[PDB]
Amino acid sequence: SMTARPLSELVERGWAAALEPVADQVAHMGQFLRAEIAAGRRYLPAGSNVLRAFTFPFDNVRVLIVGQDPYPTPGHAVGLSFSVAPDVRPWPRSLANIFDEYTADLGYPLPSNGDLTPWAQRGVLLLNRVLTVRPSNPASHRGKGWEAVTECAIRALAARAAPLVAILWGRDASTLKPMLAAGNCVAIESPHPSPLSASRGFFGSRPFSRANELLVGMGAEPIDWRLP
């Protein structure tokens, strides 16, 4: 529980230090979620998955992907942005669009399922600007306190003595751009992959190959994006 236990228990070691400026805020978010339940509203993903992106090592991140907020359908969000459990079908529409672009950009076959954990295990941070949502109500937790947490995460990533490429999908994600100003960091911005915006510039954006060209130009290893 975010309300009950400290960052050193909840997230990976580098992340616990990176998020120290927002320790109280994370506890505050736990209190917010408690209040939602007391009031008769639910949230997604499950409490134990809310901070899941911060359970993969901070020092190993080479690419950051940021979306808006979690999937609003119960059974979809898993605490890694855009990912679903390997048994979920059909795929949510944002994910189908991401995979469409993945095939077009990289030439790989469509993935077997919607599980993006391989990316997380290979140094891709799968973040959302806001880390919870009320079921069936996209953007319902906007402005409730998560933004300070994800702002802190990005600042910390940008301050590392390491290369970083950011991929910012959509308007809420794009508000992290000022913080990404650092010489060791470069940002790709595009419209969100949702059907609401994908045709404004998500399709054809080639984020995966662009990220790898940027990494190699900073002397970093490219991401192996291939999913099974």
Ligand SMILES: NC1=NC(=O)NC(=O)C1
């Ligand atoms: N539909 C979704 N939109 C997002 O911005 N992030 C997710 O994790 C899922």
Ligand SMILES: [Cl-]
């Ligand atoms: Cl609800």
